[PDB]
Amino acid sequence: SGAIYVGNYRVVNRHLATHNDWANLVWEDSSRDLLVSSTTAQGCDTIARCDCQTGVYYCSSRRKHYPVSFSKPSLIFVEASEYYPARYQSHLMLAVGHSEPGDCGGILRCQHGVVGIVSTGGNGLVGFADVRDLLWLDE
Ligand SMILES: NC(=O)[C@H]1CCCN(C(=O)Cc2cccc(Cl)c2Cl)C1
Ligand SMILES: [Zn+2]
């Protein structure tokens, strides 16, 4: 579990969205596994605007923060699941690191702020859904 709270917005994994998120929907994209909903209270997470390829992520399955090197956002094939058929997930970044289902929602951060959230993983790898291109979250 996990989410990003910036201004009057809440960013979560699309496959974990609640009834409230769908009733206060701003934007959603199945190919990115993202959903953004409106909030009554102001959020104070800083979103990063960079091309950093190193950072630190939180892993709930180990109660630990781990440093990682990660790839540039791209189209990566994701195996069929209970939430989606077999497809290409866009804007995804991979790193060598531990993850298990339950770690989705964990935040990835560099020195400039929030880079993205855990969305896929396995085989000794972890996948992060990038958010640095969504400039409307700040304005
Ligand atoms: N983004 C997707 O399509 C997900 C949906 C849930 C299923 N999924 C996975 O990769 C499962 C998983 C295994 C090991 C580590 C992690 Cl963090 C995860 Cl999410 C694809
Ligand atoms: Zn950065």
What atom in ligand 1 is closest to the CA of residue 102? 17
Q: And the tokens for 78?
A: 């994701």
Note down the domain range covering 33. 3-44
| Contact present, 6 and 132 (Cβ < 8 Å) | no
| Contact present, 70 and 118 (Cβ < 8 Å) | no
| Contact present, 89 and 119 (Cβ < 8 Å) | yes
Please give the annotated binding residues, written as ranges.
Answer: 50, 52, 110, 112
Q: Within a 10 A sphere around the Cβ of 62, how many other Cβ atoms?
A: 12
Q: Within a 10 A sphere around the Cβ of 139, how many other Cβ atoms?
A: 5
- How many domains would you assign to the chain? 2
The Cα 41–Cα 88 span in angstroms is: 35
User: What residues are in contact with ligand 1 under a 6 Å CB criterion?
Assistant: 15, 33, 78, 81, 83-84, 89, 99-101, 103-104, 118-122
Co-location of 105 and 60 in the same domain: yes
Active site residues: 15, 33, 104
Co-location of 58 and 12 in the same domain: no
Q: And the tokens for 1?
A: 């579990």
Co-location of 38 and 50 in the same domain: no
Co-location of 38 and 93 in the same domain: no
**Rounded distance from Cα 121 to ligand 1 centre (Å):** 6
Label the pairing between strands 54-59 and 107-110. Answer: antiparallel
The Cα 22–Cα 24 span in angstroms is: 6
Strand order in the sheet with 74-78: 64-69, 54-59, 107-110, 113-122, 125-130, 87-96, 74-78
Torsion of CA 87, 122, 9, 68, to 10 degrees: -120
**Rounded distance from Cα 127 to ligand 2 centre (Å):** 17
Resolution at which this structure was determined, Å: 1.9
Q: What is the 3-state secondary structure (H, E, C) of the chain?
A: CCCEEEEEEEEEEHHHCCHHHHHCEEEEECCCCEEEEEEEEEEECCECCCCCCEEEEEECCCCEEEEEECCCCEEEEECCCCCCCCEEEEEEEEEECCCCCCCCCCEEEECCEEEEEEEEEECCEEEEEECCCCHHHCC
The Cα 49–Cα 110 span in angstroms is: 10
Co-location of 32 and 72 in the same domain: no
